[PDB]
Amino acid sequence: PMTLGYWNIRGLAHSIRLLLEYTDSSYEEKKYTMGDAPDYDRSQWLNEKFKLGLDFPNLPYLIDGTHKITQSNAILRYIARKHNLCGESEKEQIREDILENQFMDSRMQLAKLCYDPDFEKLKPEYLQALPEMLKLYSQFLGKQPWFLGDKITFVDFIAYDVLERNQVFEPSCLDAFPNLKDFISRFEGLEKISAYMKSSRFLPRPVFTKMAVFGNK
Amino acid sequence: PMTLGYWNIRGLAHSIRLLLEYTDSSYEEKKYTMGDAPDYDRSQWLNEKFKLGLDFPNLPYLIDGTHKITQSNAILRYIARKHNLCGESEKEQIREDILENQFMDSRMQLAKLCYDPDFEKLKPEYLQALPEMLKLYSQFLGKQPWFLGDKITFVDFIAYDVLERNQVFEPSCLDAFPNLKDFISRFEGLEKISAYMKSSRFLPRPVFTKMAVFGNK
């Protein structure tokens, strides 16, 4: 078995869990929690942070025998690699890295709103810019069933997440982009995935359980 | 002839320059520039932005014949892959993913405060939290000449710019870490790297944007 670990919330560990299901990987989730006090105490992780014995302690993490991986991307590539879910040619590879990185910056932009207290006043900013960075993805993807081509790679697990996050934030965001919304319906079509969305284990409390009224409240 | 492209000021494209020079790649730097504070006008690029045919207009970028690339890491990996500067074994594979993504984090940490309005107030914090980061690296190298092992790869280049940038903020920061020092010495003393260092083609303005009152010159 393997061991993944993150906060009781969504966070980065999401796609990571999704990629772990598509590969039938037998993993376990050491879930850490933030103290429900007005001020959320994050010292639960801290207590173990250094005892796990990780090269660069941080959450999320994945331990596997003689392999304790850290850094969201570093964890995904590891799994994907063991299941041929990575690009094979320079071509599919340049697309792969561009996306891999891009989606991250994009993951940040949305996350910023939540990290910043003055969300409500700054929320519009992200909303107005959305379409531009959206059409870019829908154009790059184009007529492809999966972002890279006719084969599914780890990069889709990243994609889907960054696209669902914007979908729950604002549902109309994808209506003008048929292929993008269609992309999501295809992802949420994989047996191994659909089945997972019908599992006994999913959020006990709402999304963003801790931090940001964008879920916390 | 490949095509690079970034603001006149050093920025983050320092690693690509070094790698390109270490790999003897013929390249033409299409240097851009902005206006002065407060009007930080960056028109030249702004207009040119989309006509370049970049599927994801962003800076920096590299136009390699057909392969037009964006995203720092992507550009680095491309070149690094062209001349075999990468990890082969799963140990080297997993190793480079960790560091590559980690250094990016640290690189995001430093700049975030130089671009920050209260730099003169955040400064002592990063100082106090520098040794943690800096030790983590020294522990992840030990007696190895290169982070990956016995091969210089793009990681060592990316690790150089960061360790270099941090050795500016506080020149003594890495003094308590002897191997980190020998590393910097090691990189700087490479047949081709040295030649580039002491050239007439090494003159972009210092550490990041002029907005930041951090080593502007």
Swiss-Prot record, chains A, B:
Gene Ontology cellular component? cytoplasm; cytosol; extracellular exosome; intercellular bridge; sarcoplasmic reticulum
Q: Where is the GST N-terminal domain?
A: 1-87
Major location (coarse): cytoplasm
The catalysed reaction is: RX + glutathione = an S-substituted glutathione + a halide anion + H(+); 11(S)-hydroxy-14(S),15(S)-epoxy-(5Z,8Z,12E)-eicosatrienoate + glutathione = (11S,15S)-dihydroxy-14(R)-S-glutathionyl-(5Z,8Z,12E)-eicosatrienoate
Subcellular locations according to the entry: Cytoplasm
Q: Where is this site: Important for substrate specificity?
A: 209
Keywords carried by this UniProt record = Cytoplasm, Lipid metabolism, Phosphoprotein, Transferase
Q: List, alphabetically, the InterPro entries matched.
A: Glutathione-S-Trfase_C-like (IPR010987), Glutathione-S-Trfase_C_sf (IPR036282), Glutathione_S-Trfase (IPR040079), Glutathione_S-Trfase_N (IPR004045), GST_C (IPR004046), GST_mu (IPR003081), GST_superfamily (IPR050213), Thioredoxin-like_sf (IPR036249)
Question: Which EC numbers does the record give?
Answer: 2.5.1.18
Tell me the residue numbers annotated for binding glutathione: 6-7, 42-45, 49, 58-59, 71-72
Q: Output the CDD domains linked to this UniProt entry.
A: GST_C_Mu, GST_N_Mu
Question: Which EC class is this protein assigned?
Answer: transferase
Tissue expression, as annotated, is: Muscle.
Gene Ontology biological process terms from the UniProt entry: cellular detoxification of nitrogen compound; cellular response to caffeine; glutathione metabolic process; hepoxilin biosynthetic process; linoleic acid metabolic process; nitrobenzene metabolic process; regulation of cardiac muscle contraction by regulation of the release of sequestered calcium ion; regulation of release of sequestered calcium ion into cytosol by sarcoplasmic reticulum
Any single Pfam family the record assigns to this protein: GST_C
Phosphoserine, modified sites:
26, 43
Domain (GST C-terminal) spans: 89-207
Q: Which residues bind substrate?
A: 115
Q: Which PROSITE patterns match?
A: GST_CTER, GST_NTER
Q: Would I find DNA-binding among this entry's keywords?
A: no
Which GO molecular-function terms appear in the entry?
Answer: calcium channel inhibitor activity; enzyme binding; fatty acid binding; glutathione binding; glutathione peroxidase activity; glutathione transferase activity; protein homodimerization activity; transmembrane transporter binding
Q: State the function annotated in the UniProt record.
A: Conjugation of reduced glutathione to a wide number of exogenous and endogenous hydrophobic electrophiles. Participates in the formation of novel hepoxilin regioisomers.
Family, according to the entry, reads as follows: Belongs to the GST superfamily. Mu family.
Oligomeric form and interacting partners: Homodimer.
- What protein does this entry describe? Glutathione S-transferase Mu 2
* Name of the coding gene: GSTM2
